[model samples]
Target: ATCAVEVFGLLEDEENSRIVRVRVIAGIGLASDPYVRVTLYDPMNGVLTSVQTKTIKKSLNPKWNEEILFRVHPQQHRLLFEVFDENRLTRDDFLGQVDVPLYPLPTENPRLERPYTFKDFVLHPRSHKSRVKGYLRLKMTYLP
Candidate 1:
């Protein structure tokens, strides 16, 4: 269906700095029993991992404002996400999924909150598949 994700970035302790904070804001016109999962993708560093938020039981527009964090040094990377419909009575269903990139920022902005409106297919923005949508909020905080 559709989604609303609010992502953010901030500085961290120098001891463990480079990080990306993705706030799973909400979903609209979404699922039967929807849950969110976010993938952290850093191609160059061979970094690929996922984090998930709590599931909301049977809501049309589920709002789960939870934080999913990942640690990475500065690199060209992006965020990939998916929403699923929970079904214990049956096999879990894949509602829809999308990917958003981390745009370049000024060298001096430590705090960034970017809102993305995604209306594309599950891949390639037009890779011949069922389409999904989102307004994901995301950020990347870096320290060296």
Candidate 2:
């Protein structure tokens, strides 16, 4: 029962067919080789894709400061924040993961200081049936 996921920069890339962009800002939790994973899930369309940040060594406060881009998508998509504990001797353990719905996104033109350009998502794990202490942060836009 601890820790949360902290990310930054969520903007829709107009360069492509509604491409989605994201960045791994930071994460805070007690860990042994932890890393952040971002996945694009189109539950409404049954589409799936992803990207991830590099692993940070033995640090609870992990910061990759890395940005990732996903394929073309729409408002019915979602961004998944998955944190894993690396175990060199075995498979990595999924500490926690949460989904941020992109549907019904804020209707506003995001600017340097003009709209709700960033948000903190304090979410629980979908993998666990019971309550789990885990959350995430995301700064993003709604469209291309």
Candidate 3:
């Protein structure tokens, strides 16, 4: 397992057909290494294909806990994570990994759907915090 997978913008030159855009946020409040490197693999035979790695000089950086995004193909479903030096000095140690359904089946359109529910109402909020809360309430209504 590799500790961290560094995320550069993209290697457009090396790849064309299958591209995985990787973004990462190292876990916070953890004692281990500078960063974590995660690799996407073929779940069936367990072969390493694509990787995401990051390195951190200091432990307490804002970027450490940010979201790490990976733009992977729907074909690649299982992901394996590795911790730096977890395996040995030469190869990064293998951390456990997870499998996810990259591509989902298309949602069926509602043939017998109800018309959109429309309602008009005035919203009044006194404090600054209330404005945010008001928006949240409106959001709830909009979703339902």
Q: What TM-score fits each model?
A: 0.60, 0.67, 0.38
Task: List candidate 1 stretches off by more than 4 Å.
Answer: 1-17, 44-47, 105-144
**Model 1, TM vs. native:** 0.60
Ordered by lDDT, highest first, the candidates read: 2, 1, 3
Q: For candidate 3, what is the lDDT?
A: 0.34
Q: CA lDDT, every prediction?
A: 0.57, 0.60, 0.34
Kindly indicate the candidate among 1 and 2 with the higher TM-score: 2
Q: Which stretches in model 3 have alpha-carbon errors above 4 Å?
A: 1-20, 50-52, 60-76, 85-99, 104-144
Superposition error at 63 for model 1 (Å): 0.6
Give me the displacement of residue 123 in model 1, in angstroms: 10
Q: Which lDDT tens digits does candidate 2 get at residues 1-144?
A: 263433233344444335445656666553277787777766765537666689988876677766665544445667778888788999987666767765454433555443424555554565545333444556554333
Task: Give the Å shift of residue 99 in candidate 1.
Answer: 0.9
Predicted model with the maximum TM-score: 2
| Model 1 Cα lDDT, one tens digit per residue, 38-63 | 77776765436677778889876777
Please provide, for model 3 over 1-144, each residue's C-alpha lDDT reduced to its tens digit, 9 standing for 90 to 100. 484644322333232223332334333232223444555545575644554445555443214433343434445444444333233255543222223343432322346553333222232333444321111000001001
Rate residue 114 of model 2 by lDDT. Answer: 34
Q: Write the number of the candidate with greater lDDT, choosing between 1 and 2.
A: 2
